[PDB]
Amino acid sequence: AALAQIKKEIAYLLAKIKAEILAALKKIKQEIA
Amino acid sequence: AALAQIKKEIAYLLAKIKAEILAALKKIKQEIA
Amino acid sequence: AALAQIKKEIAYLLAKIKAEILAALKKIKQEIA
Amino acid sequence: AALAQIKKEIAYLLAKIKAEILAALKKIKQEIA
């Protein structure tokens, strides 16, 4: 169980990092368009 | 085995995050070029 | 304990990768603004 | 040992994802400058 818990928590953090980076990229595409 | 399974699945998620970020970056380089 | 230690260290590295990428993005938004 | 091996390999993949993303960002900052 603990292994699957670690996997789930890292997966969540990856998705959070991705969403935050794409948020800043869209602010840049929004600035230019 | 479960450890290698966790590693393989995180590796996959990393590659997915990378491809998605580079997809949005190319939409931005495409907009400007 | 070692499992939680691995999780904590990967979490730290993710946050470092995110901060560095957002640093370069802001240098780009700064260039254009 | 296997746990530390998994950690080392994910760490490597993170650094590879970061370097590749910053490579594409610099191609974009290079295009505009």
Side-chain angles (χ1 to χ4, degrees):
Chain A
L3 254 201
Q5 189 198 259
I6 171 177
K7 190 194 63 56
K8 247 70 86 178
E9 285 175 14
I10 289 170
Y12 177 70
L13 293 183
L14 284 170
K16 196 163 171 199
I17 164 186
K18 191 195 63 172
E20 291 182 15
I21 288 174
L22 294 177
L25 272 168
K26 281 164 188 171
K27 287 181 200 176
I28 192 183
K29 184 180 171 184
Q30 196 170 141
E31 177 136 294
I32 289 164
Chain B
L3 254 201
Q5 189 198 259
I6 171 177
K7 190 194 63 56
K8 247 70 86 178
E9 285 175 14
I10 289 170
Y12 177 70
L13 293 183
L14 284 170
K16 196 163 171 199
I17 164 186
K18 191 195 63 172
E20 291 182 15
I21 288 174
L22 294 177
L25 272 168
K26 281 164 188 171
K27 287 181 200 176
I28 192 183
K29 184 180 171 184
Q30 196 170 141
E31 177 136 294
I32 289 164
Chain C
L3 254 201
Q5 189 198 259
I6 171 177
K7 190 194 63 56
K8 247 70 86 178
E9 285 175 14
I10 289 170
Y12 177 70
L13 293 183
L14 284 170
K16 196 163 171 199
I17 164 186
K18 191 195 63 172
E20 291 182 15
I21 288 174
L22 294 177
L25 272 168
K26 281 164 188 171
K27 287 181 200 176
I28 192 183
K29 184 180 171 184
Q30 196 170 141
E31 177 136 294
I32 289 164
Chain D
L3 254 201
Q5 189 198 259
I6 171 177
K7 190 194 63 56
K8 247 70 86 178
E9 285 175 14
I10 289 170
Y12 177 70
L13 293 183
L14 284 170
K16 196 163 171 199
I17 164 186
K18 191 195 63 172
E20 291 182 15
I21 288 174
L22 294 177
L25 272 168
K26 281 164 188 171
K27 287 181 200 176
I28 192 183
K29 184 180 171 184
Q30 196 170 141
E31 177 136 294
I32 289 164

